[PDB]
Amino acid sequence: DLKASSLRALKLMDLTTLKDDDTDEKVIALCHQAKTPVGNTAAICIYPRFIPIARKTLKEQGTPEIRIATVTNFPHGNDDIDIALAETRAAIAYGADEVDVVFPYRALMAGNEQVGFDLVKACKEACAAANVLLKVIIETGELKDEALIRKASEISIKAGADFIKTSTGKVAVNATPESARIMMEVIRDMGVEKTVGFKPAGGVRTAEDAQKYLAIADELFGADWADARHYRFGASSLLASLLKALGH
Ligand SMILES: [Mg+2]
Ligand SMILES: [Mg+2]
């Protein structure tokens, strides 16, 4: 049923705005939108500079349980660990609940597996010390090949990713059911489904597509696995489509 999958998907959304024209007022509006008439999203995802006003806004409307996710090393996934760590420490100091860091995928495409491992591990150590979850964006659209998607997923998991996420939403190709299945198969094959969640992101716009992404999760790990600690939708306009499927 689409309605059951849509409500489920809504409660798993990282409701996102990551735009050149973002403003405090736009993030405040996103916070109000996260408190939907059928329930709250799992989180918002915003640039780090909007975290403090977002936290205040979420608290004052009585939804402090809507988590605050942000992005670092974003969107480029450069291989400078000092910079990626510095942005991650800034995100923490701002008040992030979760940091979505971009894996250095161009370095991996060049044959360097080590910098990706160290970059994820450095950011994880900072986040873990602050009780902040770390998601790792591997950019499946640029990786393109299934072997590289598996490898970037494997490196991120071994380096301590709490989530692996398909995409930044800033490149030509983002989440696809094919890329989602590959990444979830890595979680399954590595036996880390209890400690590593999955997050399709970018281009996920319809309730029909959200249903397909959850179906893959249900198929691989059972219908009870995809909770907020283990599954998120990185999306924006998807919320309107999920609500329309629900009667709002
Ligand atoms: Mg470099
Ligand atoms: Mg070393």
Residue numbers in the entry: 3 to 250
Question: What did the article's authors report about this structure?
Answer:
Deoxyribose-5-phosphate aldolases (DERAs) are acetaldehyde-dependent, Class I aldolases catalysing in nature a reversible aldol reaction between an acetaldehyde donor (C2 compound) and glyceraldehyde-3-phosphate acceptor (C3 compound, C3P) to generate deoxyribose-5-phosphate, DRP (C5 compound). The 3D structures of several DERA enzymes have been solved, and there are also a few complex structures available. These have revealed that despite of relatively low sequence identity, all DERA enzymes have the ubiquitous TIM (α/β)8-barrel fold where the catalytic amino acids as well as other amino acid residues around the active site seem to be relatively well conserved. The DERA reaction proceeds via Schiff base formation between an active site lysine residue (K167 in Ec DERA) and the donor acetaldehyde substrate. The active site of DERA is located in a deep binding cleft, where the donor acetaldehyde binds to the bottom of the cleft and the acceptor glyceraldehyde-3-phosphate to the upper part, near the cleft entrance.
The crystal structure of Ec DERA N21K variant, which had lowered specific activity on DRP, and wild-type like activity on DR and acetaldehyde, was determined with and without the ligand, D-2-deoxyribose-5-phosphate (DRP). The complex structure of Ec DERA N21K mutant revealed binding of the reaction product from DRP cleavage, i.e. glyceraldehyde-3-phosphate (C3P), to the acceptor site in one of the two protein molecules in the asymmetric unit. A similar conformational change in the loop around residue S238 in both the Ec DERA N21K mutant and wild-type structures can be seen upon glyceraldehyde-3-phosphate binding, when uncomplexed and complexed crystal structures are compared. In addition, in both N21K crystal structures, there are slight (about 0.2 to 0.4 Å) movements in the positions of altogether three active site loops containing residues G171, G204 and L20, respectively, when compared with the wild-type DERA crystal structure. The N21K mutation is located in the third loop. These small movements slightly narrow the access to the active site of the N21K variant and may thus contribute to the decreased activity against DRP in many of the N21K containing double mutants tested in this work. Most of these residues (i.e. G171, G204, S238 and S239, N21) are according to the structural data (by others and us, see also below) involved in binding the phosphate group of the glyceraldehyde-3-phosphate acceptor substrate.
